[PDB]
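Case study.
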Amino acid sequence: VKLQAVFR
Amino acid sequence: VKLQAVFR
Amino acid sequence: SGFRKMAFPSGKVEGCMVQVTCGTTTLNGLWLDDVVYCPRHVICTSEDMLNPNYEDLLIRKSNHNFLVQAGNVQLRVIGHSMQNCVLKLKVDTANPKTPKYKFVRIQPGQTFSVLACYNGSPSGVYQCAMRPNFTIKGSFLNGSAGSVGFNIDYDCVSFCYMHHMELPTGVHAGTDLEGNFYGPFVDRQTAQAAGTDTTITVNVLAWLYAAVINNLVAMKYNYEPLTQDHVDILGPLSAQTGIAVLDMCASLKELLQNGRTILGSALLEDEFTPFDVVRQCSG
Amino acid sequence: SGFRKMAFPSGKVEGCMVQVTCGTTTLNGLWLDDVVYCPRHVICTSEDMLNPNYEDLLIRKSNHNFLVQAGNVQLRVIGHSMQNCVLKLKVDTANPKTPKYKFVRIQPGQTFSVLACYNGSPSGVYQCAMRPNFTIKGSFLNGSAGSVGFNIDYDCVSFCYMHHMELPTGVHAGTDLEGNFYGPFVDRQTAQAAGTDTTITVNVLAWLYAAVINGDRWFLNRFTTTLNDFNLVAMKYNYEPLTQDHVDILGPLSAQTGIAVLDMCASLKELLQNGMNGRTILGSALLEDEFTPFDVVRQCSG
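After joint prediction, the assembly is written out as follows.
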């Protein structure tokens, strides 16, 4: 269950 | 065979 | 002649895709008049995904923590607010490429065109159905959230989807442009899973027709219930073939027994609405 | 995650679609710089398309005979030339939305996106493969001609296709943008039929790799084999022979998955023998061949 923004 | 311009 | 899965010309929507960054978290945004719309989890961090409080996280942030790149042009954010799961960022410039538009919450069964974006750049367009379990079968990687689904009726762009997340199954959930989710999903990385999928009955009918041109045993075979407003919509397509709605509804049974290709497919295809047939076939 | 038939965004092409009228004949044309490109049979009447001579049908015609509407605006035709089966109308006005563009001739096997148009107004976009028989299973109606096929790199539109006609099987024939037809067809209503269509082998193999990357693995086996022997078995289901160039370009996908190309061919073989046993691959109940290695790498990696 992945939030599909880019996290860094 | 059909040419697919409109000839009307 | 010919029948293919077909997206709307994406041009009028590409003009509206910007990039939205909060700290180091980045995703796509929808710039319309003087308002950017974007999934609200852009205000999260990797450490901060499991159980996030968007209302505290939002309070900590000012206009100046929202970076919007619309091409080169950095848009200066001059206002911020949260409606359900989407941010609203008021900006100095109205989008000069803003088309006629309105938000709508589509029903399961209905189809829209998805403009897959990354860093605010349109990457690809494909055709999606809102499935019964309120998921879509997409192609979406990291950076894809804020990607929009839309339909074009006149040159009114009706936005019906903004993307947020993928599920373990390989499918996708998101919101209408009021930030309300489709189905019972929330923007956090807790174990969620989709309802079991039905099959859109009216759409497999509509498609059966489309082949030619080139009741309710459905609980048994996991086909959603067919309705009166569906056989009034399908009307035009039963007239065009001479095969009445119920007439076509007949053929349905010896198919779900032992149904090699139909329009290329050896399965009943339900990702095409009857409007999607009318447009392509006699339209 | 996911794998889907995915078109290039069509914006850049949309800004170049005009309609061309000549007599009561109308189709779509491609407005790049100060030239519109369209199919030449626009100069034909209904009465003179069974057996036309284009080189005079053009000498019989004048700049003023050519109408080009770019939405609201009319465009003044200040020149015309013919090059193979396309007309080049020079116009007083360079297209201010002209994108970076090349013109390319693609191979059988390669994909492009088709912006379908009517009356110069774009209708919808969809992905197409050039078949081995040099046709395309498109979705075109009357007035679709001059609709174009394209690939975008970052901001560079390569035009590989323009639309002319519909063969009597429901499949489509067009030219590159220098007007040379793909395959043995000609723009007149004489008896033409496509050569019997092969399957794009490499494409199906890339499509299997795509399915592995999304989870479906069931069609795999510990069986490996010999190119020549898989070829001998392909030649028996109407698959094109697979070259040693074809193996090389699967190289990347073979890496990412650890499945060696030869191993995937043995997986393809065992499918063709026994079929899919009422199973699915990526939501399809038959082997999809309209997806290039690039098509798949483009969707599955970043």
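Observations recorded in class. Strands of chain A lie at 2-3. Chain A is about 0% helix and 25% strand. We will return to this complex in the next lecture.
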